[PDB]
Every structure is written in structure tokens, then in C-alpha cells.
Design a protein around this ligand. Structure first.
Ligand SMILES: Nc1nc2c(ncn2[C@@H]2O[C@H](COP(=O)(O)OP(=O)(O)CP(=O)(O)O)[C@@H](O)[C@H]2O)c(=O)[nH]1
Ligand SMILES: [Mg+2]
Ligand SMILES: [Mg+2]
Ligand code: NA
Ligand code: NA
Length: 414
């Protein structure tokens, strides 16, 4: 039998709208990540999607077909159980340009990534570019490029596009990144993609001695409708542990925390609670480590966690020392061009008093520029941001023609 463990690695799935990210995740895991009614109605990913799968290999069989996502080797004529390799998980990002900030959030949770490129659309599309560049900036460089939808084009058309992708990646950090052609919809050449995942997205080393930090992207509660208040189960906080590990019964805090109103005046106070449960997908555990999206059960009033209220927060141990900042200094660099725009645009220098969007961890916050220098800016934030380390990368976006576009990045200076 295969062991039941948490996923040990997160693989992002990114790319331009409708290029087939969610269908690819389904082809690999059997799971459709879109859970929300609006997503299903509109036929699009809006919030970050999630799915897990075990990965194994039939040692007596030929690759890539030997790779499996279930404990069976009958597909290669063997009655033996395949060797369990690891459990993996996917962070499924929205492709729509208006949702770039959500991709950025997701990128903070990724150990590696798949960039999905549709073989039947002209490469490189705006969000192909924007997602690629974002991955590069954030440091998600264990990348596989997947040519999807090859089922609707000839081999030669696909090869033409392949050449284009090689041209695009040449001279960049991704010059030697593999390109794997598949059909996500009709499930063709998926085995080669599994093989590629095993080869190019190794599980990263984890320093379990680092202080526990979790980036929050979800919050909710399991209580069925018509439940007595005095017997409601506590709120649940979902996210990914980026360092250290958490354990059941640990005293934790949510930062920046809760919005407090004192007659118009608005401040933030840390939310202290205790871990009552730990779950990955459908399985319970006593501890949670990096890799996978974890659901942290708590003793919080469900009203505090309702409807992903805590998105962008972080969770640490109760006694951790973490700056919660309403002003930040950033050592920055701007892109030459607004890569996510349809028409080519040069990035204008940062100006004092302009409003910028800052992506830090899973958080997205607007701020006003209070100082501009060649290598540094200072920003007055509309809401505070938790800065858990000294080398955190932020992504900078600017509103151009009514659309928030990535224009640069920086290090948050402590
Ligand atoms: N012919 C073909 N169609 C595909 C393939 N993969 C996905 N599609 C189709 O493309 C459309 C969008 O697929 P979907 O997986 O939702 O794409 P997405 O990139 O996740 C959309 P979003 O960017 O909003 O998250 C669907 O109609 C789907 O059936 C493929 O390999 N071949
Ligand atoms: Mg999708
Ligand atoms: Mg083809
Ligand atoms: Na599976
Ligand atoms: Na990472």
C-alpha cells in the first residue's frame, strides 16, 4: 500500500487565459480545481485552485509510461505495486489579465511551475509573458513549459511554435527549460509530463529549524447550514507553509490580523488563536510542513474567517517577532516594458505621490509613494503588511489605462 502523507512540493500552473491550465491539472490529478459557483458559471478560474496527486513509478516498465498517479502497474502488464515516489500538489492560477495580482499571490506558494502555452494561439500572448516574467522575478525557476492543445494542430505547426518558444527563452534564465507537448483535454502524452515533473521539479530542501511561517490564501468554516451558534465549529485558515512547520495545539497568531474600528479610526490587531486541527485535502495530520495547501482548524469565531476574509495574512507562532508595517522601504528595479499589456508600453519611472500596488507574500496592498530615489522607494501603505524576513521580494504594479500591470520588483528593506 502507498503511504498517506502531505504533498511535499507545490507546482504552480500559469499561463494566458484559456490556454488550458485547469484542464491540465485535471489531466494529472483527476480533480477540477474550480470550486466556486461564479467560476463554474463564467467558466474561468478566479481564486487560486488546488489539487493533489501521488506520483509513483513502475520500476520494471519502460518510461515515461512507467510513471503513474495511482498504485497500479497493470497498464504495463505488471501485477506488482509501483514504487511510491512522492505526493505533489498544484497551485492553479487564473489567466485573466484582470487577475494578475492573484497569480502573483499564488507565485509566493510555488516550489516550481508549469507555464502552459496553447499550441493553437499566437505565441507569446500577454499573460504568457507576464506570468513568465513574474516567475522569473519571484524566483520560481524550476520551470517546465507545456505546449497544450496539440491535438488541434499538426505536428509541424506545434514544432513552429516550439521554435518560437526556444527563441523567446534564449538569453534568459529559462534558456534550457524543457518544452513538453500534451493534450490536457484528451489526455495525450501526460506520462511525459509526469516524467518531466520528476526530473525538473525536485522537492526543495526544507530547513525545518526556521521559524514557522504560513502564507494565507483561504479562510472559511465547515459548519452546515442551520447549525446552532453556540456549537459552531471554529474557523479554518487555508494557505501554504513557506518555512518551518506547524503542529496541532500550537499557539499561533494571524498578522496583521483584525481590522479594528474606533469611531471612524481604523487600526489592526493580531489575531491570537490555537491550532485545533490540521488537514491536507481529505486527510488529517498532526503536523504540517512546506508543500501543499494546508487547512488549519482554529478556535476562532467563524465570522472572523468567513469568505476568505484573511487572504493576504500570515500565520506565525504566538511569540514570533514580526514587523507589521504601514510604511515600507523597497530596493527596486523596473522592467523596461509593460510586458502584460496588449500594445507595447515603456515603463515610466516611479513618481512621488503615485499609487502603486505591492505584492508581498500572499498579500496585495495599495500604497502612496512618499520618496523616490534611483534604487529605493518609500511607500505609505493603505493597510499594513506583515514582513517576516529580511529578504522578501515584492512585485510592483501600476494602474495603466484602468488595468493593474506588473512594472517592476524589489526587496523589502528592514
Ligand atoms: N482542444 C483542446 N482544448 C483544450 C485543451 N485543454 C483545455 N482545452 C479547452 O480550453 C478551454 C479552457 O480550458 P481551461 O482548462 O478552463 O483553461 P484555463 O487556462 O484554466 C482558463 P483560466 O485562465 O480562466 O483559468 C476549455 O474549453 C477546455 O476544454 C486541450 O488540450 N485541447
Ligand atoms: Mg483555470
Ligand atoms: Mg498535433
Ligand atoms: Na492521483
Ligand atoms: Na517558492
Amino acid at each position: 500500500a502507498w503511504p498517506k502523507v502531505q504533498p511535499e512540493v507545490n507546482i504552480g500552473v500559469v499561463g494566458h487565459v484559456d490556454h488550458g491550465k485547469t484542464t491540465l491539472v485535471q489531466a494529472i490529478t483527476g480533480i477540477w480545481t474550480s470550486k466556486h459557483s461564479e467560476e463554474l458559471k463564467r467558466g474561468m478560474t478566479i481564486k487560486l485552485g488546488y489539487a493533489e496527486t501521488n506520483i509513483g513509478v513502475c520500476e520494471s516498465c519502460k518510461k515515461p509510461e512507467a510513471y503513474v498517479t495511482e498504485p497500479s502497474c497493470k497498464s504495463c502488464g505488471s501485477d506488482d505495486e509501483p514504487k511510491f515516489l512522492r505526493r505533489i500538489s498544484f497551485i492553479d492560477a487564473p489567466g485573466h489579465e484582470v487577475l494578475m495580482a492573484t497569480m502573483l499571490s499564488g507565485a509566493a506558494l510555488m516550489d516550481g511551475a508549469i507555464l502552459v502555452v496553447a499550441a493553437n494561439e499566437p505565441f507569446p500572448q500577454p499573460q504568457t509573458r507576464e506570468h513568465f516574467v513574474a516567475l522569473g522575478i519571484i524566483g520560481v525557476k524550476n520551470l517546465i513549459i507545456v505546449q497544450n492543445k496539440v491535438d488541434v494542430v499538426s505536428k509541424e505547426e506545434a514544432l513552429s511554435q516550439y521554435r518560437q518558444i526556444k527563441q523567446f527563452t534564449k538569453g534568459t534564465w529559462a534558456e534550457n527549460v524543457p518544452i513538453i507537448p500534451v493534450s490536457a483535454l484528451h489526455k495525450i502524452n501526460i506520462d511525459s509530463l509526469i516524467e518531466g515533473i520528476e526530473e525538473y521539479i525536485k522537492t526543495p530542501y526544507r530547513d525545518l529549524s526556521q521559524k514557522p511561517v504560513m502564507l494565507v490564501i483561504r479562510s472559511f468554516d465547515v459548519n452546515k447550514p442551520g447549525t446552532q451558534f453556540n456549537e459552531l465549529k471554529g474557523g479554518v485558515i487555508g494557505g501554504s507553509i513557506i518555512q518551518g512547520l506547524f503542529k496541532v495545539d500550537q499557539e499561533i497568531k494571524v498578522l496583521p490580523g483584525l481590522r479594528v474600528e474606533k469611531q471612524g479610526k481604523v487600526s489592526y490587531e493580531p489575531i491570537f488563536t490555537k491550532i485545533s486541527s490540521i488537514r491536507f485535502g481529505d486527510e488529517e495530520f498532526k503536523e504540517a510542513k512546506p508543500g501543499g495547501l494546508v487547512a488549519i482548524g482554529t478556535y476562532l469565531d467563524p465570522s472572523l474567517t468567513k469568505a476568505d476574509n484573511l487572504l493576504g495574512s500570515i500565520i506565525t507562532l504566538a511569540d514570533a517577532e514580526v514587523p507589521v508595517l504601514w510604511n515600507i522601504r523597497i530596493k527596486y528595479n523596473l522592467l523596461e516594458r509593460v510586458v502584460g499589456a496588449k500594445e507595447m508600453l515603456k515603463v515610466d519611472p516611479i513618481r512621488a505621490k503615485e499609487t502603486l500596488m505591492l505584492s508581498v507574500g500572499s498579500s496585495t496592498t495599495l500604497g502612496i509613494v512618499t520618496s523616490v530615489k534611483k534604487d529605493e522607494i518609500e511607500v505609505e501603505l493603505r493597510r499594513p503588511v506583515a514582513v517576516w524576513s529580511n529578504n522578501i521580494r515584492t512585485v510592483i504594479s501600476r494602474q495603466i489605462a484602468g488595468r493593474w500591470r506588473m512594472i517592476g520588483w524589489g526587496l523589502v528593506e528592514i
